[PDB]
Amino acid sequence: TQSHYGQCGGIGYSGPTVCASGTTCQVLNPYYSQCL
């Protein structure tokens, strides 16, 4: 799982995309998605 302000997605990312409870995944740009 990811933590708050954690990268859940974004090109080049090869990690889990599930944000910690209480948060959600938010695409920042086509190369980064933060969890807020």
Curated annotation (Swiss-Prot):
* Disulfide bond sites: 8-25, 19-35
The entry's localization annotation reads:
Secreted
Glycans attached where? 1, 3, 14
Domain (CBM1) ranges: 1-36
Q: What is known of its domains?
A: The enzyme consists of two functional domains, a catalytic core joined to a carbohydrate-binding domain (CBM) by a serine-, threonine-, and proline-rich, highly glycosylated linker sequence.
Q: What does this protein do?
A: Exocellobiohydrolases (CBH) that catalyzes the hydrolysis of 1,4-beta-D-glucosidic bonds in cellulose to release the disaccharide cellobiose. The degradation of cellulose involves an interplay between different cellulolytic enzymes. Hydrolysis starts with endoglucanases (EGs), which cut internal beta-1,4-glucosidic bonds in cellulose to reduce the polymerization degree of the substrate and create new chain ends for exocellobiohydrolases (CBHs). The CBHs release the disaccharide cellobiose from the non-reducing end of the cellulose polymer chain.
Any other noteworthy remark? T.reesei produces two different exocellobiohydrolases. They are unique in that they can hydrolyze crystalline cellulose in the absence of endoglucanases.
Query: To which protein family does this belong?
Result: Belongs to the glycosyl hydrolase 7 (cellulase C) family.
Spell out the protein name for this chain.
Answer: Exoglucanase 1
Taxonomic path: Eukaryota, Fungi, Dikarya, Ascomycota, Pezizomycotina
Q: Which gene encodes it?
A: cbh1
